[PDB]
Amino acid sequence: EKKPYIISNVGMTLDGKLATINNDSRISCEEDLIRVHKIRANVDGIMVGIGTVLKDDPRLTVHKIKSDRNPVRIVVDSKLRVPLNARVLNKDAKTIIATTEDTNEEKEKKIKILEDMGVEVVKCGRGKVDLKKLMDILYDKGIKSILLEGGGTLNWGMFKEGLVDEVSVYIAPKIFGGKEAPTYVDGEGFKTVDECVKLELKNFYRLGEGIVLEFKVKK
Ligand SMILES: NC(=O)c1ccc[n+]([C@@H]2O[C@H](COP(=O)([O-])OP(=O)(O)OC[C@H]3O[C@@H](n4cnc5c(N)ncnc54)[C@H](OP(=O)(O)O)[C@@H]3O)[C@@H](O)[C@H]2O)c1
Ligand SMILES: OC[C@H]1O[C@H](O[C@H]2[C@H](O)[C@@H](O)[C@H](OCCC3CCCCC3)O[C@@H]2CO)[C@H](O)[C@@H](O)[C@@H]1O
C-alpha cells in the first residue's frame, strides 16, 4: 500500500468556471469529450464528489469511445446523500461510495440497500471523508490510477492534502462570470502563494475551438 496515481482533469471556461450560476455546464466540445473518455479508458478508477452527482447525475463510464470494461466509480459522500436512483449506481460498472464512519439508523439502512444493489460502501473518517486514508483503501483494492473529475469542492480537498499528481485542463473559449459560479477549485482556499499548489506546464495544444493544458504537480 501507498496511494494511487491521481490525474485531475476538468473542462472550464476562460474565467475558471465549471458551470454557470444556473448549473449549465455545456463547456467541453466533442473533441475534448473523446480525449476525456480515452483517459477514462486508461485508469483504474474515476472519482467524483457527491456535489457533482447531485447536480449532474453522471454515469462516469466510457461511452463515446471503444470500451472493453469500465473503471471503478468512486463517490466521496460524507452523509451518504447519493440518490438511490443515481445513474452512478447503475450496473454499467463497479461502484464504491466513500462515506464517513459517523452513523445513524437511517444511514445504516441506506447502506444495506446500496449493498443489495451491488454497491460497495467504504467508511473512512469523521465529519468529512478522510481522503488520505481513502487512498490507502483504494490502493489495497488494486486501484493504482484514478481520474479525478471533481468537482470544485472535492478538488480543493484533494489539492489541500497534496494527493494530486498531474493536471490536464481543457479551457473553452467562453466566459460565464458569477462570484457564485463553481470554479475548478473552490473550498477554503490557500491563504498565501507560499502554501499554494505549484505546477509545471508540461504540454499544451489546441483542441477544437479551445486549448488543453497539461501540468505536473510539484510535490
Ligand atoms: N466541467 C467539469 O469537468 C466538471 C467536473 C466535475 C464537476 N463539475 C461541476 O462542479 C460543480 C460543483 O460541485 P461541488 O463543488 O458542489 O461538489 P464537489 O466538488 O464534487 O464535492 C461534493 C462533496 O464532497 C463532500 N466531501 C466529503 N469529504 C470531503 C473532503 N474531504 N473534501 C472535499 N469534499 C468532501 C462534500 O460534501 P459532504 O460533506 O456533504 O459529503 C462536498 O460538498 C457541479 O455542479 C458540477 O457541475 C464540473
Ligand atoms: O432507524 C430508522 C427509523 O428511525 C425511526 O424509527 C423509530 C421508531 O419510529 C420509533 O417507534 C422507535 O421508538 C419506539 C418507542 C420507544 C419508546 C421508549 C421505549 C422504547 C421504544 O424509535 C425508532 C428509532 O430508534 C423512524 O420512525 C423510522 O421512520 C426510520 O426508518
Quick one: which ligand is closest to 160's CA?
A: 1
Residue type, 82: V
Quick one: which ligand is closest to 105's CA?
A: 2
How distant is the alpha carbon of residue 5 from its chain centre? 14
Q: How far apart are CA 119 and CA 83, in angstroms?
A: 13
Q: What is the dotted CATH code of the domain comprising 1-219?
A: 3.40.430.10
Residue burial 27-54, b: 16+ Cβ < 10 Å; e: rest: bbbeebbebbbebbbebbbbbbbbbbbe
Sign of the alpha-carbon torsion through 98, 153, 213, 203: negative
Return the residues preceding each gap in the chain, C–N over 2.5 A, or none: none
The residues, ordered by sequence, that sit 6+ positions from 135 with a Cβ below 8 Å of its Cβ are 3, 4, 163
Sign of the alpha-carbon torsion through 73, 147, 12, 192: positive
How was this structure determined? It was done by: X-ray
Q: Are 113 and 119 in contact (CB under 8 A)?
A: no
All three cell numbers of 96, joined, read: 464504491
Atom of ligand 2 nearest to the CA of 104: 1
The DSSP line for the chain is ----EEEEEEEEETT-BSS-TT-------HHHHHHHHHHHTTSSEEEEEHHHHHHH----S--SS--SSPPEEEEE-TT----TT-GGGSSSS-EEEEE-S---HHHHHHHHHHHHTT-EEEE--SSS--HHHHHHHHHHTT--EEEEEE-HHHHHHHHHTT---EEEEEEES-----TTS-BSS-SS--SSGGGSPPEEEEEEEEETTEEEEEEEE--
What are the binding residues for NADP(+)? Answer: 11, 52, 56, 78-81, 129, 151-154
**49 phi and psi angles, rounded to 5 deg:** -90, 155
Laid out side by side, the sheet with 5-13 consists of 120-123, 95-99, 72-76, 45-49, 145-150, 5-13, 166-172, 210-217, 199-207
Strands 166-172 vs 210-217: parallel, antiparallel or unpaired: antiparallel
Cβ–ligand 1 contact at 150 (below 6 Å): yes
Torsion of CA 27, 202, 135, 81, to 10 degrees: -10
Q: Give the domain ranges of the chain.
A: 1-219
